[PDB]
Each structure stands twice: as structure tokens, then as C-alpha cells.
Design a protein around this ligand. Structure first.
Ligand SMILES: Cc1cc2nc3c(=O)[nH]c(=O)nc-3n(C[C@H](O)[C@H](O)[C@H](O)COP(=O)(O)OP(=O)(O)OC[C@H]3O[C@@H](n4cnc5c(N)ncnc54)[C@H](O)[C@@H]3O)c2cc1C
Length: 310
């Protein structure tokens, strides 16, 4: 029985583990792959105080930092169910897909999320070489270049507006006959001179020169006609899917599947906290996730000292 069991080992979970183990408590960190989303990216220029680093290096540094403390790091395990303590102060349980069950006085869920993919040939090949899922992260890299934003929800429309102020031209492709973003965002986007919006648009292929992106092919869903666009960057903003369906019925979630948390990262279940992209935190970034993990760790500690075991 851990004093705290952190589920997910991306930036948020790692931060939580460091904060928890620093208090000398029995700390477990169970995740599918240490490092989380940062493992698939290269250049990171917004991890505050570090002008430039990369995913591999950063995940490595996160592991070293976690290993400076007494943390039981469990890797390649997926939480499949949360069994809330039946009685106040009782142990919470995390079951795994592999068939194990772990017990803990407090839980910190930090399972992150998955950005939906275009699922087209060329997408994988060009990830980090023009295909990007983060406007906040890579916007600064496209000055003077043409780019596309895939997705017409708030995230995509905001991203297109954001990029339009930095890049040469932006083309937003919306799968549906209409964008779902708030009207104010739609009006703002449509008012920009260096932006063109394509509705009923389904991307079909990412084209590159063997090294980086050079274009995008898509299909018009109404006519079925195929079209091409020249560009250097493709920002995929279809949607974010929090890794939280396994918690269905155990902890409240908002309409987007994000775990509902208050400022202290507390869920509706006492002793169960959550941090990072899997929560209702409004923005999804490494530095934001790390700060949240620290908060959740501190709240879990406060919970432990305020509640009597069993
Ligand atoms: C390609 C890419 C590039 C990015 N570049 C930047 C950047 O430059 N700067 C920036 O600030 N942000 C960037 N981000 C976003 C940033 O990586 C995330 O906001 C950050 O990693 C979120 O941290 P997290 O811990 O909340 O979750 P995540 O990193 O997602 O990690 C959650 C971890 O939990 C695991 N997990 C999931 N389900 C379970 C389960 N049931 N049981 C156990 N473990 C589970 C996940 O597989 C993962 O390893 C990028 C994201 C992507 C996808």
C-alpha cells in the first residue's frame, strides 16, 4: 500500500512523484511509458528556463530527477479500473490491464491525453518534420511559411488565428459543413486576410520531400474531388482525447472527458487527485503539466495528514 500511487508517468506524473517522494512517503509511479507525450517530439523551446531541449533529453532528465528520490517506478502497465475506498480513510485500488491490483492511501491520476490523428499516409513520416499537434509549441517555427490547421473547433480556429499573426498564410480544413468553434472565433478567423477556410475537407495525405512537409492533399466530402495545397506545416487540431475512459463512473469528468478538478487538483473522490492533460486544466503544455503534478502531490500529502488510516 503506497502512501501515494501516481498513474501515468509523463511530465505531470513525474513531477508528482518527485514532490511526493521528497516528503519521504511511499511513492509509486505507474505508467505505460515514462516521459509521456514528450517522448515523440524533438525540439522543445517553451519549457521555462530551458531555451531549447528535446523530448528524449527531457524525458531522460525527468527520469534522473525522479530517481534521485525513493520512487517505485513501474513501467509498461496500464490502469484499467479505480476502486474507490469503500470507507473514509480506506485504501484506494488501481487494477491494471495485465491483471494486477495495487493499493494506495491516495491516488494521483496523470494519464494525459492523445491528440487525434489525421490517419493518412505521410503523417507519421513527417511528425516533427512539419506535422505538429501543438500550435503553442511550434507556431514560432513557421515565420514566413504557409501552414494548415486541421480542425474547426475552438482549438483549431484559435490556432489558425494565432498562426495567422506569425506565419505567411494559414489554411484551416474543417471536415464538417460548418465549424463548431464559438461564433466570435469564427468571425475573427474569417476576418483575417492571410487565411482561407475549407469546409467539407478531409485530408487524405501528407506530402514531403523525404525530409520535411511540402504539401497536403485532401478530399472534398461533397463532390469527392481531390485537391492539393503547398505548405510547410500542418497543425492537427482535430481533438484531444483524455486517457480517462477507464475511470468511467469512478471519478467525475466534464463533457470533454477531462477529469474535473478544483484548484487543489482534487476530484470528487476524497484522496483521489488528478494532474495534467487528463484534467480540466485549460491548456495542455509540459510546463503546465509539471506545475499541476506538483500541486496534486502537495494536495495528496495534505489529504494523508488530515485523514486517519482505515
Ligand atoms: C508531438 C507533441 C509535441 C509536443 N511538444 C510540446 C512542446 O514543445 N512544449 C509543450 O509545452 N508541450 C508540448 N506538447 C504537449 C505536452 O507534451 C503535454 O502537454 C504534456 O506531456 C502533458 O503531460 P502529462 O503528464 O499530463 O501527460 P502525458 O505526457 O500524456 O503523459 C501521460 C502518460 O500516462 C500514460 N498513460 C495513459 N493512460 C494510462 C493508464 N491507463 N495507465 C497508466 N499510464 C497511462 C501515457 O501513455 C503517458 O505515458 C507536445 C505534445 C505532443 C503530442
Amino acid at each position: 500500500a503506497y502512501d501515494v500511487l501516481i498513474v501515468g508517468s509523463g511530465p505531470a506524473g513525474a513531477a508528482a512523484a518527485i514532490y511526493s517522494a521528497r516528503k519521504g512517503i511511499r511513492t509509486g509511479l505507474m505508467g505505460e511509458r515514462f516521459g509521456g507525450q514528450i517522448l515523440d517530439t524533438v525540439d522543445i523551446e517553451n519549457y521555462i528556463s530551458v531555451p531549447k531541449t528535446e523530448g528524449q533529453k527531457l524525458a531522460g532528465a525527468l527520469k534522473v530527477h525522479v530517481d534521485e528520490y525513493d520512487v517505485d517506478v513501474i513501467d509498461s502497465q496500464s490502469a484499467s479500473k479505480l476502486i474507490p475506498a469503500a470507507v473514509e480513510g480506506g485504501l484506494h485500488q488501481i487494477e491494471t490491464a495485465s491483471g494486477a491490483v495495487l493499493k494506495a492511501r491516495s491516488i494521483i491520476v496523470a494519464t494525459g491525453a492523445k491528440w487525434r490523428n489525421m490517419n493518412v499516409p505521410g503523417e507519421d513520416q513527417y511528425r516533427t518534420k512539419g506535422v505538429t499537434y501543438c500550435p503553442h509549441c511550434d507556431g514560432p517555427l513557421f515565420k514566413g511559411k504557409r501552414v494548415a490547421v486541421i480542425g474547426g473547433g475552438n482549438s483549431g480556429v484559435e490556432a489558425a488565428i494565432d498562426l495567422a499573426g506569425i506565419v505567411e498564410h494559414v489554411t484551416l480544413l474543417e471536415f464538417a459543413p460548418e465549424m463548431k468553434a464559438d461564433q466570435v472565433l469564427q468571425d475573427k478567423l474569417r476576418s483575417l486576410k492571410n487565411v482561407d477556410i475549407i469546409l467539407n475537407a478531409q485530408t487524405t495525405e501528407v506530402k514531403g520531400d523525404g525530409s520535411k512537409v511540402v504539401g497536403l492533399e485532401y478530399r472534398d466530402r461533397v463532390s469527392g474531388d481531390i485537391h492539393n495545397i503547398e505548405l510547410a506545416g500542418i497543425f492537427v487540431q482535430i481533438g484531444l482525447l483524455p486517457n480517462t475512459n477507464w475511470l468511467e463512473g469512478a471519478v467525475e469528468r466534464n463533457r470533454m472527458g477531462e477529469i474535473i478538478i478544483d484548484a487543489k487538483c482534487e476530484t470528487n473522490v476524497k484522496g483521489v487527485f488528478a494532474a495534467g492533460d487528463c484534467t480540466t486544466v485549460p491548456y495542455k503544455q509540459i510546463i503546465i503539466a509539471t506545475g499541476e503534478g506538483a500541486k496534486a502531490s502537495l494536495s495528496a500529502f495534505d489529504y494523508l495528514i488530515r485523514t486517519k488510516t482505515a
